Design an enzyme around this catalytic site. Structure first.
Site, short mmCIF file in Angstrom:
data_model
loop_
_atom_site.label_atom_id
_atom_site.label_comp_id
_atom_site.label_asym_id
_atom_site.label_seq_id
_atom_site.Cartn_x
_atom_site.Cartn_y
_atom_site.Cartn_z
N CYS A 165 -14.45 16.28 7.73
CA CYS A 165 -14.94 15.79 8.83
C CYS A 165 -16.62 15.94 8.65
CB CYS A 165 -14.62 16.04 10.28
SG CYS A 165 -13.38 15.19 10.92
N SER A 212 -15.19 -5.18 6.59
CA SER A 212 -16.34 -4.81 7.47
C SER A 212 -17.64 -5.41 7.05
CB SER A 212 -16.20 -3.23 7.64
OG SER A 212 -16.12 -2.65 6.55
N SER A 251 -14.50 -6.39 0.95
CA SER A 251 -14.54 -5.86 2.44
C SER A 251 -14.54 -6.58 3.72
CB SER A 251 -15.85 -5.15 2.35
OG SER A 251 -16.22 -4.54 3.68
N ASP A 255 0.84 -1.26 0.08
CA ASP A 255 0.13 0.03 -0.11
C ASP A 255 0.97 1.38 -0.03
OD1 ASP A 255 -2.09 2.20 0.86
OD2 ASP A 255 -2.97 0.71 2.20
N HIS A 265 0.55 -0.13 -4.66
CA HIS A 265 -0.76 0.59 -5.29
C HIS A 265 -0.66 2.22 -4.92
CE1 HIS A 265 -3.19 0.24 -1.33
NE2 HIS A 265 -3.06 -0.96 -1.18
N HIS A 296 -21.02 16.07 8.27
CA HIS A 296 -21.90 16.53 7.27
C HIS A 296 -21.28 17.46 5.92
CE1 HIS A 296 -25.57 18.02 5.82
NE2 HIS A 296 -25.58 19.55 6.19
N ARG A 345 -5.42 3.04 -7.89
CA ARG A 345 -6.62 2.69 -7.10
C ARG A 345 -7.57 4.09 -7.33
NH1 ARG A 345 -7.58 2.17 -0.42
NH2 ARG A 345 -8.83 4.04 -0.19
MG LIG Z 1 -5.10 4.17 3.20
#
Ligand SMILES: [Mg+2]
Ligand SMILES: [Mg+2]
Ligand SMILES: [Mg+2]
Ligand SMILES: [Mg+2]
EC number: 4.1.3.1
Lengths: 418, 418, 418, 418
Positions: free
Chosen positions: D191, D317, D315, D153, D180, D193, D228
């Site tokens: 952060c 999660s 994924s 990564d 990548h 909204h 990516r």
């Molecule tokens: Mg990352």
């Protein structure tokens, strides 16, 4: 359970901010409760960072001015203190070129790993602590404070607000007294014709300075925060979003999408005024020493913030003798001090002393072998009159201090009382 | 699958050992098959270690002698090469005092983390590689070989045979050309009255030298292995178990269990002869430079091993001018070279140049500010005549090299053909 | 000047030694003045080391016993605390195999760089501090003390008394609560027939323990010092110079000069008694968990030192179910605690959990891809019932904590009051 | 002098680019002469990086697909290979959370020092090399290739083109097979909204990919470059300068000056086509596994570049069992492989296995002490049938390999032939 490292209450913190003159004219846009919320349930004490920051703050008010030389190794800093200097400047440029964690030699563009300067801060403190330990067992009181405050280069924080936060926190853990942060995006500096440094918005630098102050507050130490502006030579800016930057934007936009901006002293003065409520000292980066520009910059800032202290780098590359007479060279720093430049330094002093001394010795050695080394050794013997102690090399790196530890641990041997 | 890094067969290794003059008179008590058995199925190539070691070996036969100065930073090594030196000496003592991974200042007693010298070897190679890169894009052909071989201090390997093995392996990974190994147990050095350095048995040092050679063989590089004996001054030895050490055992054993042993040039000569079959060069550690003593050691060893090359450290602490006349100082290395001391160095050259130059600059600076810096700058301008280039600071650390990478990456920017 | 970090006077230190029950039956062969003499003029506060050591000491008296599992990564320690453990054990063996500064995988023979354990102690503290920070902003009070004390492996200190001193100092700087020190010379362990571990003299280990206590005293923290003896299995000793070791000397000396010595519980008991005045806890290294042998050791030492607390490692390699019934396994630690083994741990718990869980997941994955991962995920979902939180991965590593720092810095963004 | 590491000529390099099918459809906007100019006069060979990149490239064509699991320690990677996996995925997220050089736990926002992933790459290779060494002396041929290629990564390179260049070069020095690079500016992620990820211009990512390819070319290894795109969820972009990004720009601009942009699969497909000539594999970052989106993305890219291979993160999660039946879970990767997703991985597999296994063991241990450890030990004994070897812990970390070195060095002991 334990009360060790119990955090202060928000009320106590607010009280310090309201009453300690250290915080006079220091704007914090977050609250005391905000600080406490980030402290978890135990706050590590950072002794060297606290002491250094306090000593530095007092010196900036007690001395005519504080001056320093860039140090890139522990022994360099020790010699600076031994020689009488009261502060250490930790140059990011020197770390990039000869003391960073990648092991590579780099130019000044925030290319090295972000925890490199903090490691050198910790190294310098460790070296000063050894000198301090040795002085104590030797009964040497010639130097009053071995733990001179360290002012370290934080570049632009290696990223955004969280990267600046982590760097400040790491500098503090290592024992830094002060840190400087600048308003450019070095990683986007454009090459050649029509290129140059790229500034970030005035509000983004206020964020950087706000983040640097926050990390010091969360770490519970009064770190000296220095804001540096690079608008004197920068010809580009990332965005025209900040209305305070718009007056200097021409309109032309580059292929990368940056905005051309008019450089010079004008934008430096403006950014300096915008940064003042967020900085203990302000520094206008400059390429050519110029007393008039310095006077113009300081008078303009002080017209708005009379008690604002300034910082100044004395160019290591300027050909001083060629352009100025000896008297001007001799009075340069005193003159700047009178204008309010209370922290002064030569960024690359260590890089020049290290490269030059080794080139000179090696060249003489390649030509005449031992004769060249003897020349250096004789200068070292002569320097002893001025207080130089490194000719006693074993002593200098702590052999007597470790011999004392060995003796202390040996029950059949007694140590000599101090 | 892949043939990248496939190990050579034991027969190929044996053939090289049998025929390459590099291995003339090199004893290996283990077999070629033993080497192959430890190489797994892929052998990483160590370019810098191979090239450095081959270059050093040739220089030791082609030049009158190879001399060097202790370097503790990458820039220090760059200036040594720019000044004309052909090898770099990497002092463990300097690493202990100002460049080791603990961040602390230490005396010379194998106190720093065992991977410290390897990291500095990697750093010096990176720095020389950058000087080489800059030279190439600048068309500078003034220096013929920027990658000068590095000879590094392995202390006594930080433990047993496996610790020596891992240190030699790490030095090679970092690109070392040669490494030296000594026969003492520094961690048990006794302070004060009747104390002193503690030797290990002759056979244990042969184990050390055999382990350093084995690691070089497993790593497939012809590393130069240097043996150092500390028997000139050592007054103790861990055991009287080796009959070759018995002629010097006094019969007294200390409260810590060490054996009192007769020191001086005699045990040095015997150890040197026992070590000869296991070392490319031999070094008798000595406190007092003395051409006659050097001649006595040299002739005694060469009477047994006529072709044995020797190494010699020219004491940085000895008060040269107080004890020798300028003529003797001027001819010292030349004279030693004639005796067979083909590798000569000054261990603490860097420590002294760095400490002295910063004390001198800082002292002048504390007194007269910019006037002091101008004095150093003028010396640097004058050194450009001798080839010094660090006055062009940005160029010196690669700003031009990275500007080229930047331009190479930018398709709307062309690079000037070299 | 500053009073930040001013050292206590020798009289204050002596008063604490005289009156604090912490030092009951603690022998120090050096003086309070000897401690002050090594502290220079500023003593850095080590918050985590102080708090950890105080907490551990109280837990050792308040709980039936303190137990722990070897942790080699920060997250491993976090899960240990989240799961309810009250102390963390930091195994040097695990550090050698998968977490040391050389980057290599090693067996247990003091092969890794000496500052490796300290770096992992610092890492575990940082990780626990982050869990603590997250808990505080989440209002999670399920864990009462995230900063569980860390007990770390000091091996035999990587050399002599000065190497042990520096390792203890580095462990304290990193925030260790306690450290263990053993009486063998691992670097000389002999392989094969008639080989085995090599002990050092009883007096040398007392030197080690005295040096670890001295470093803790100089650093001004009440570090828990644990003494380990390897005499149960060791068959050799470096010297027969200490009359306390003579009853076990066989009279035979090996080709390497080591003395053959009678092993077993007898020399362990004698060493334990000699070490008692210098250790807060004593540990007899043993290959076979055996309640009777443990009782014999415990009773023999307590007959001399009734209040001596002991530590016990429950062998990770012993085939428990093959040799003991489930009932004996279930009561094992409880039973040991009743004998006075107040600190109990499984050294390689982390190595086994990490290696096994990845082999199992990878094997299933190689065979059935996502089906294998889903099996682990389902176990994690089920563990949330027991308090497991890592299924909320972003939260687990601080995404919420840094979002809060980001929001605190942003003036156009308010933080929710805690 | 030496021919060791002599650079190839520009003509030779051009010839490889023109004729090796590895470079089919690979666009380089700089020339072969440009590469040579940056190589100095010696090119270090990077064996592991060369072999890994070559093996990975062949596997992507020979196997139905290559799959991997994130590994954050050396032992994790060893178990993955032992279990049958053919590649290793080195997650930046896991490094941030539990294996980076700051020692801190961090969320995924490029907060850790930039040389952290390269250090873990070197560690994993070192661990695989030890397994390889052990297998050889044990005559274990059960695993054909211990040196499985590592895909690492590179986040967005920690800065600009020069930061990406240095990271790629460091990954290569450490032995990486592929890396990548993504098109967002994590350090500016907004952060709450209306916040979210901030993309950089399409041309800036082409610069990143061009810089990554250049570093591999200068280092002379065929590194696999993976692009990516984060446009699936990103709602912001730094600038509207690139006409390829304008179709998605709405017009609203944020306080920071960023531009709101329409997210989704459309911009991912467009960026993927723009990146294709600069990437060996393309990866659409996604939050929810979605076979239809995957099919849509791959068919759209392949309609333009039929032979373009794709990469896919499954994924960690997503609640797989809750949303999909067992058959769909079982066929997920095979189905993606048919669409052209030839490199597949689960980024946080190591983080979950490590946290879960320690939480489970520790929880059971806090409740039932030794009984809980015995449960894990029994599973390990059972896993031996599947080839698990870590129950023999000494062997697993190399004790037999180091015993062999000790034996090799010992002339009085013979090694057993292989
Ligand atoms: Mg990352
Ligand atoms: Mg800079
Ligand atoms: Mg030495
Ligand atoms: Mg151990």
């Amino acid at each position: 359970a334990s009360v060790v490292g119990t955090p202060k209450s928000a009320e106590q913190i607010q009280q310090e901010w309201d009453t300690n003159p250290r915080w006079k004219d220091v704007t914090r846009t977050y609250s005391a409760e905000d600080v406490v919320a980030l402290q978890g349930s135990v706050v590590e004490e950072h002794t060297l960072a606290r002491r250094g920051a306090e000593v530095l703050w007092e010196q900036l008010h007690d001395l005519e001015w504080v001056n320093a030389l860039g140090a890139l190794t522990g022994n360099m800093a020790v010699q600076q203190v031994r020689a009488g200097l009261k502060a250490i400047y930790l140059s990011g440029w020197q770390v990039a070129g000869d003391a960073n964690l990648s092991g590579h030699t780099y130019p000044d563009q925030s290319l090295y790993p972000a925890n490199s300067v903090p490691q050198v801060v910790r190294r310098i403190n460790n070296a000063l602590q050894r000198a301090d330990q040795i002085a104590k067992i030797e009964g040497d009181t010639s130097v009053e404070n071995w733990l001179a405050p360290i002012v370290a280069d934080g570049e632009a924080g290696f990223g955004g607000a969280l990267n600046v936060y982590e760097l400040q926190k790491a500098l503090i853990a290592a024992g830094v007294a002060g840190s400087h942060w600048e308003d450019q995006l070095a990683s986007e500096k454009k090459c050649g014709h029509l290129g140059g440094k790229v500034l970030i918005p005035t509000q983004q630098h206020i964020r950087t300075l706000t983040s640097a102050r926050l990390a010091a507050d969360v770490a519970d130490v009064p770190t000296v925060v220095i804001a540096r502006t690079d608008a004197e030579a920068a010809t580009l800016i990332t965005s025209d979003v900040d209305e305070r930057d718009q007056p200097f934007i021409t309109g032309e936009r580059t292929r990368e999408g940056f905005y051309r901006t008019k450089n010079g002293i004008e934008p430096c003065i403006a950014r300096a005024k915008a940064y003042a409520p967020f900085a203990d000292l302000i520094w206008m980066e400059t390429g050519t020493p110029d007393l008039e520009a310095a006077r113009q910059f300081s008078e303009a800032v002080k017209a708005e913030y009379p008690d604002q202290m300034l910082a100044y780098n004395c160019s290591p590359s300027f050909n001083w003798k060629k352009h100025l007479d000896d008297a001007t060279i001799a009075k340069f720093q005193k003159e700047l001090a009178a204008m309010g430049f209370k922290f002064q330094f030569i960024t690359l002093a260590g890089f020049h002393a290290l490269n030059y001394s080794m080139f000179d010795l090696a060249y003489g050695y390649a030509q005449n072998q031992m004769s060249a080394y003897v020349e250096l050794q004789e200068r070292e013997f002569a320097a002893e009159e001025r207080g130089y102690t490194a000719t006693k090399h074993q002593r200098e790196v702590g052999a007597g201090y470790f011999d004392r530890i060995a003796t202390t641990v040996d029950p059949n041997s007694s140590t000599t009382a101090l």
